[PDB]
PDB file of C-alpha atoms in Angstrom:
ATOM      1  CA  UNK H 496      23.155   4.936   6.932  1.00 44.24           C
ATOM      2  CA  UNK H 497      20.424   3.690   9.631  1.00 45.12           C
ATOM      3  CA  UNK H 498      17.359   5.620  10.603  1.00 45.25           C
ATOM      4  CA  UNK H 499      15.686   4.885  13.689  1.00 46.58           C
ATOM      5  CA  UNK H 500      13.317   7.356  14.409  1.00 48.04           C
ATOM      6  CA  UNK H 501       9.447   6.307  13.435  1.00 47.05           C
ATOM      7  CA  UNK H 502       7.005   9.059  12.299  1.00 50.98           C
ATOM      8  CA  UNK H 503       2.867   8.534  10.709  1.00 52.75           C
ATOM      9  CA  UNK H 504       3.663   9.209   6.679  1.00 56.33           C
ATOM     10  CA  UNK H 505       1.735  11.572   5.442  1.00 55.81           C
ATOM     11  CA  UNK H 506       0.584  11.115   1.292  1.00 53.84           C
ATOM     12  CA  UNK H 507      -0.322  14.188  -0.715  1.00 57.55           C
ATOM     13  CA  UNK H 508      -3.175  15.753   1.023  1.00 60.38           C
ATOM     14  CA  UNK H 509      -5.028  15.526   4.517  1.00 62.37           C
ATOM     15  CA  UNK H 510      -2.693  16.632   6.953  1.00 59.27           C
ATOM     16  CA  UNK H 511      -2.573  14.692   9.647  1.00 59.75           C
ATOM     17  CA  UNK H 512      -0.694  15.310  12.720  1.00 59.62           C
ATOM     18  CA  UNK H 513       0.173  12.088  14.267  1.00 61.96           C
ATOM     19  CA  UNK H 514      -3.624  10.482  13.965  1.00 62.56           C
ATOM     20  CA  UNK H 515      -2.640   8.241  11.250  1.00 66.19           C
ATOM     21  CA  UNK H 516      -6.208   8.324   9.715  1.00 64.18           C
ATOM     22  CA  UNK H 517      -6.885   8.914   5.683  1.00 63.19           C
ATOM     23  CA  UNK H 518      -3.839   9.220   3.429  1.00 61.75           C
ATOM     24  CA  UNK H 519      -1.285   8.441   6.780  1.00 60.52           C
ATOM     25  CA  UNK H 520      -0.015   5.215   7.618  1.00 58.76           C
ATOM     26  CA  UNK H 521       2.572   4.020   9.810  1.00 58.97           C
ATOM     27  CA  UNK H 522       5.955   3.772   8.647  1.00 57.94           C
ATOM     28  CA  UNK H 523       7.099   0.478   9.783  1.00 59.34           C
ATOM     29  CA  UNK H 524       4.972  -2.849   8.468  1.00 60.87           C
ATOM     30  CA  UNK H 525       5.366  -6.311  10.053  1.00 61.72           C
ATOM     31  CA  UNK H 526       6.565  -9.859   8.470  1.00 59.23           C
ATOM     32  CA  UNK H 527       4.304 -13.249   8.243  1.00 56.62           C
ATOM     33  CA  UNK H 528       7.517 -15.444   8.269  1.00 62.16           C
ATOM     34  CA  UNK H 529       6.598 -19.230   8.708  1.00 61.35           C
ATOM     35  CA  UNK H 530       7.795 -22.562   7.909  1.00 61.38           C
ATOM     36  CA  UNK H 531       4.976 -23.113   6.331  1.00 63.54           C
ATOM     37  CA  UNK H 532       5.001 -20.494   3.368  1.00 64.35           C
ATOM     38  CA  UNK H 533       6.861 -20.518   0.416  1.00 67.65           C
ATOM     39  CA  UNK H 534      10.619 -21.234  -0.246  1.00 65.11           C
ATOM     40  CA  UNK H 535      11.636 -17.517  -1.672  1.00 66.36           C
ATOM     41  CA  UNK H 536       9.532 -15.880   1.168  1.00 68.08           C
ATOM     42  CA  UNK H 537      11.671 -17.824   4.101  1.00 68.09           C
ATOM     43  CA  UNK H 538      13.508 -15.770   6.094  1.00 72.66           C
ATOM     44  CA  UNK H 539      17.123 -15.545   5.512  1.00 74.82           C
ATOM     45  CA  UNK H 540      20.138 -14.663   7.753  1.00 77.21           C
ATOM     46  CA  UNK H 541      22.581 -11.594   6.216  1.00 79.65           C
ATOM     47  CA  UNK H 542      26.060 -10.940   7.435  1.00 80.25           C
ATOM     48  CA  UNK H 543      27.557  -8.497   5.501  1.00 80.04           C
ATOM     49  CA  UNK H 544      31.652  -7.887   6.045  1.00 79.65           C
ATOM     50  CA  UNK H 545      32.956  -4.152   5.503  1.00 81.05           C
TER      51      UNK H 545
ATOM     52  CA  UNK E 397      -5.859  15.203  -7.995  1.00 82.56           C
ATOM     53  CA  UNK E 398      -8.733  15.027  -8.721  1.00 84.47           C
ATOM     54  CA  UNK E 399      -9.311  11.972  -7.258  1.00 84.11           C
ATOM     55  CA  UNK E 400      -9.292  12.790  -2.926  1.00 81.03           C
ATOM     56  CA  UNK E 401      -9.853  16.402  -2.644  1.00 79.37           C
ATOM     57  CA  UNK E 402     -13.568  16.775  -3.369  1.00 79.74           C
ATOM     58  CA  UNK E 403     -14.587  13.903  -1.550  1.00 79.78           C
ATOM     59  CA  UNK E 404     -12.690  10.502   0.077  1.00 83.16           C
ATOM     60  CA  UNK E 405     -13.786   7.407  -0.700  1.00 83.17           C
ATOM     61  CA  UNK E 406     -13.491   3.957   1.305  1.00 82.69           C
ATOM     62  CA  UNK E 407     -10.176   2.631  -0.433  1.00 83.07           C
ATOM     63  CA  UNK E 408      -7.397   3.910  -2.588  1.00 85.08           C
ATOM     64  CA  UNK E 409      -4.363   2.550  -3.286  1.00 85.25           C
ATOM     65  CA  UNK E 410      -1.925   1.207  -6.005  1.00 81.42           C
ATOM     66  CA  UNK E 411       0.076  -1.820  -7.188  1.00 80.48           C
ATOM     67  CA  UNK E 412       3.485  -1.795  -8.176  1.00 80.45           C
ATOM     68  CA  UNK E 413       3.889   2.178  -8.214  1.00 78.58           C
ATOM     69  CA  UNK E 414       3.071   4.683  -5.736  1.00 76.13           C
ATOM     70  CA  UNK E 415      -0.479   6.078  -6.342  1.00 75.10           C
ATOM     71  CA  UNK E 416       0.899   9.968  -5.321  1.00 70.40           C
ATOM     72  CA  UNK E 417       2.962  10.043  -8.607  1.00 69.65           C
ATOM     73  CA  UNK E 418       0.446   8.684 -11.213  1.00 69.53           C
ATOM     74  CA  UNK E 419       1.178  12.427 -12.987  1.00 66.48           C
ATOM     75  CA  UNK E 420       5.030  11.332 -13.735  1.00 63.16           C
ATOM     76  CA  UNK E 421       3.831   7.700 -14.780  1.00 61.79           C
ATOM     77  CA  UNK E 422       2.761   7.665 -18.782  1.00 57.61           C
ATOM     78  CA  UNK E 423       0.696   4.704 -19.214  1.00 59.08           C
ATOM     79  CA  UNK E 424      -1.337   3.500 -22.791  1.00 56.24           C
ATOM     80  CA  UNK E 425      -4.669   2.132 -23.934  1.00 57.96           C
ATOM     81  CA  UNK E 426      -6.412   2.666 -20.516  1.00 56.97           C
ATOM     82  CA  UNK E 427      -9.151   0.409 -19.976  1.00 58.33           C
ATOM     83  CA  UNK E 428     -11.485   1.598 -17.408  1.00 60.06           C
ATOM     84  CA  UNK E 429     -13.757  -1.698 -15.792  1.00 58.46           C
ATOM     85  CA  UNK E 430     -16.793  -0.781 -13.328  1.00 61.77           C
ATOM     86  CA  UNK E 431     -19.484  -2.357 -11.573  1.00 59.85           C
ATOM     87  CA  UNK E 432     -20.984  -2.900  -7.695  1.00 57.65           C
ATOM     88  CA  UNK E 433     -20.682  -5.287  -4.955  1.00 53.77           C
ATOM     89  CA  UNK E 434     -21.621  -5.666  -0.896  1.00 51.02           C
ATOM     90  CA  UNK E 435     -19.129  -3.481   1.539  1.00 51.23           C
ATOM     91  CA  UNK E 436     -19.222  -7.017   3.151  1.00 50.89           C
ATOM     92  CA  UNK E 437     -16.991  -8.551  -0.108  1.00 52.85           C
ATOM     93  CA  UNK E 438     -14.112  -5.943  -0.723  1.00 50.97           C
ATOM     94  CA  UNK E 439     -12.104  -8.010   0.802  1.00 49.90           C
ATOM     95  CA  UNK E 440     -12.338 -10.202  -1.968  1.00 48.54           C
ATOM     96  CA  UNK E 441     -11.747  -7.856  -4.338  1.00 49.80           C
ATOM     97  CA  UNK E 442      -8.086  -8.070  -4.046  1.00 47.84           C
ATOM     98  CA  UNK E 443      -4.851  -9.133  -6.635  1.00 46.23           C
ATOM     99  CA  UNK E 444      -4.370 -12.586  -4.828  1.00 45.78           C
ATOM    100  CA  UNK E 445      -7.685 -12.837  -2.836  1.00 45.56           C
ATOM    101  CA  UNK E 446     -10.574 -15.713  -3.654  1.00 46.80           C
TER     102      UNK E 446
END
């Protein structure tokens, strides 16, 4: 399954109607992939067969 | 809770479980650790901060 659509989560409380403000955050979060970090947090390439 | 609904407060959040479902979680000998610091050094006060 694959989900595309992005929408501010909401947690408990504090509606909050696409503001992202107290208790909502956006769903998505970013990488810090570099060379320069560690050897576990490297990026690596995944080609699953089906 | 009891913990957002009376009044917020300037950051809440967990580590390794979800802080909306600390009901389900059963936990033992909770320590409880207090004290006060500058606004300005929060940012310090973090698990893998200096």
């Amino acid at each position: 399954e694959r989900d595309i659509s992005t929408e501010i989560y909401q947690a408990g409380s504090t509606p909050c109607n696409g503001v992202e403000g107290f208790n909502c955050y956006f769903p998505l979060q970013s990488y810090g992939f570099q060379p320069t970090n560690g050897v576990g947090y490297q990026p690596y390439r995944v080609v699953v067969l089906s | 809770s009891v913990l957002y609904n009376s009044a917020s407060f300037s950051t809440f959040k967990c580590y390794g479980v979800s802080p909306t479902k600390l009901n389900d979680l059963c936990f033992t000998n909770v320590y409880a650790d207090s004290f006060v610091i500058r606004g300005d050094e929060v940012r310090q006060i973090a698990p893998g901060q200096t």
